[PDB]
Structure 1
Amino acid sequence: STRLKIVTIHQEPFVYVKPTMSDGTCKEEFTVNGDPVKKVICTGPNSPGSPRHTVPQCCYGFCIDLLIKLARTMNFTYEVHLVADGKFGTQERVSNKKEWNGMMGELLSGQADMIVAPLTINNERAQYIEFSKPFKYQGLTILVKKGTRITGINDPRLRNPSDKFIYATVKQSSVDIYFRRQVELSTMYRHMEKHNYESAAEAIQAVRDNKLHAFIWDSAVLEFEASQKCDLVTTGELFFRSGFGIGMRKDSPWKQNVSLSILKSHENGFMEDLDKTWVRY
């Protein structure tokens, strides 16, 4: 018998991460619709190449609510931790050996039993792990400072780039994988490889700060940010489509029931309620 080790990642509005209070508990708060926010204690590190000091923290959001629902449905207990290197996960050459980093590496090494995060389903990862059916259907878009005018993914300041207009995504992410694998995107990939950010929050802040002119990322995140911060807009629009899934090892005994529960939640309105609570208000 064992508690599930759940790994997640900071990524608003799917996973908020906040300090505990002095006594080690999470502050009581309420949603926009008046209901209490469910929070869980999640351990993780508070700069690349430095030692990582793990401390208890508070986690909540769309994905944490989804976790609580799966746990109650399928009757498992769990402990949540934040991925130690802060990355979603890619497979990089080391040497002809390869390794996965990020949440993918923690799941494959046994440090995690389940990835519950806005984790994009793609061919590269599905070779190594099991994904559920998608709990969110979305795609990629482009975030810019209000007033910046670019048409989209085919705009010549992206396709014929210079140092005059800088764009980027998140290191060791599915967007990084996407641009690296499609030869037709190699001009964009070589430009971004010089400017990619360690996390989405840092990249978004860099757009607000006019140090990054366009950020290419998940539309589910970017449209939420633009709904909250009026100096930011997305520019259009879904140029690639993908979904987020729960990640498990291929020999997981939970994998069938997790997918059935995802499907039931789309069908009975639970997933829309989460959209209403965390995403679309």
Structure 2
Amino acid sequence: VVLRVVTVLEEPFVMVSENVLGKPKKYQGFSIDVLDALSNYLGFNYEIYVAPDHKYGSPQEDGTWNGLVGELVFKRADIGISALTITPDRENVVDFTTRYMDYSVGVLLRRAEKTVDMFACLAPFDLSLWACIAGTVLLVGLLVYLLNWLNPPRLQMGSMTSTTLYNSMWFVYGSFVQQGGEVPYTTLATRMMMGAWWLFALIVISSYTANLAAFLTITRIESSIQSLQDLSKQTEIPYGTVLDSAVYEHVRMKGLNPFERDSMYSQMWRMINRSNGSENNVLESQAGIQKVKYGNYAFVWDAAVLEYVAINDPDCSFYTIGNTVADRGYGIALQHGSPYRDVFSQRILELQQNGDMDILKHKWWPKNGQCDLYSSVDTKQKGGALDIKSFAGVFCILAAGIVLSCFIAMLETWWNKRKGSR
């Protein structure tokens, strides 16, 4: 048996890899691997040639088709295999096998260095717990003050050991922060209160040290943006696609429908459509990829392609997010009424369900390698010292207290100049 195959060049599905007299002598790629795995079982010989316009094709105004589909409609080639997308407008004129790989829409994003968070000091306790602690300090100072009046100590006559609220609360704060000398309160009530206060304070400060020790070990390669929803919700990074591409038309026709209400699609179209699409789109996939590599941009394209580029960019400078996608799958096209639809399909099924196809897929999309596709940090950082940019928040907390001491010292003489009441 002899078969003539039409293809379109696209990495990593179909590439030329040897040339003689300027003509392609060898093809390779995942779709070529599928074709060869079919040939080695069914025994057919194949001759591959490249479609002249390098387009998949569209229904012409006369009802014909151009491109690879055209080459099938005119029956100039027997079988067409490439990064086709199974769609019913195409199947209306040519047959398709069962899909051998699921299609998906992905985005390519440049990696970035870890941000310097400003308030690493506040992290160990939830931002409401500090309000609970400050309120507990105040309430314990009030409880100490009422305690000293419900049951009073016995004291030196006229001594300031009859501690006013101000002096009573000072001991509660100072003892909380592990400062100050002997607590002057001798009575069993006040001691029994202060010793449990000391136990609370020491447990709080241990827990602070212990949980700061945990952010200083968790902080690793985990931080990333990992969904289309997030990309559609943020606005700092512009995103787009190739103009008039099937991806463009897909995202458009998803987003324009007002009865579809997953707003991610409409937010994507609302970004893409700006200035007739000229704001965020590019003429070519390579231009988009380079714009991502050397600018603030993200490129929306075939997830399989972008994952292949991210795996085979030697810098690991890109990262990418994956998505579960239906309605589309790569497959093999045939002339309408061709019998091999009922010959290839069962072998494609055997390959998928035996797991044999997983070898051919791994051969081009390796499960592990140099580049961790779903992680985006300065991965060289095992750990580090605390920088001035980092610990800034605590110098701010101090400078705020300093400001409040300057305010009070300045104000106390607007008090002192009240009425002459020295």
TM superposition shift of 1:254: 0.8
Q: TM-score, normalised by structure 2?
A: 0.49
In the alignment, structure 1 residue 278 sits paired with structure 2 residue 364? yes
Deviations, residues 81-118 of structure 1 (Å, cap 9, x unaligned): 12222223444x64xx4554432222222233212112
Residue 126 to residue 8, structure 1, CA distance change in 2 (3 Å):
same
| 3-state SS of paired residue (1:278) | coil
Which residue identity lines up with residue 273 of structure 1 in the other structure?
A: I
In the alignment, structure 1 residue 18 sits paired with structure 2 residue 17? yes
| 3-state SS of paired residue (2:323) | strand
Aligned match of 1:125: 90
In the alignment, structure 1 residue 167 sits paired with structure 2 residue 240? yes
TM superposition shift of 1:58: 3.1
| 3-state SS of paired residue (1:265) | helix
Deviation beyond 6 Å, 4+ runs, structure 1: 148-151, 159-162
| 3-state SS of paired residue (2:325) | strand
- Asked if structure 1 preserves the Cα contact closer than 8 Å seen for 2:239 and 2:272, the reply is no
Aligned match of 2:216: none
Partners in 1 of 2:35 and 2:301 — Cα distance? 24
Aligned match of 1:226: 310
Aligned match of 2:109: 144
TM superposition shift of 1:69: 1.8
Aligned match of 2:382: none
TM superposition shift of 1:171: 4.9
Deviations, residues 144-194 of structure 1 (Å, cap 9, x unaligned): 2223987654457x68999x8352137554x24423533245546645854
Decide which of 248, 251, 265 is 1:179's aligned counterpart.
251
Aligned match of 1:28: none
TM superposition shift of 1:76: 1.9
Deviations, residues 10-65 of structure 1 (Å, cap 9, x unaligned): 22222232352xxx29xxxxxxxxxxxxxxxxxxxxxxxxxxxx833531122112
| 3-state SS of paired residue (2:238) | coil
Decide which of 14, 39, 54 is 1:71's aligned counterpart.
39
RMSD: 3.3
Q: TM-score, normalised by structure 1?
A: 0.71
Residue 57 to residue 197, structure 1, CA distance change in 2 (3 Å):
farther
Residue 266 to residue 151, structure 1, CA distance change in 2 (3 Å):
closer
Partners in 1 of 2:230 and 2:251 — Cα distance? 16
| 3-state SS of paired residue (1:10) | coil
How many residue pairs end up in the alignment? 240
In the alignment, structure 1 residue 248 sits paired with structure 2 residue 317? no
Aligned match of 2:323: 238
- Asked if structure 2 preserves the Cα contact closer than 8 Å seen for 1:146 and 1:232, the reply is yes
TM superposition shift of 1:218: 1.8
Partners in 1 of 2:64 and 2:235 — Cα distance? 31
Q: Please state which structure has a larger fraction of its residues in strand.
A: 1
In the alignment, structure 1 residue 84 sits paired with structure 2 residue 157? no
Deviations, residues 109-150 of structure 1 (Å, cap 9, x unaligned): 223321211222122222222111111124111112223987
| 3-state SS of paired residue (1:143) | strand
| 3-state SS of paired residue (1:217) | strand
Aligned match of 1:31: none
In the alignment, structure 1 residue 107 sits paired with structure 2 residue 102? no
- Asked if structure 2 preserves the Cα contact closer than 8 Å seen for 1:87 and 1:171, the reply is no
Decide which of 297, 301, 311 is 1:213's aligned counterpart.
297
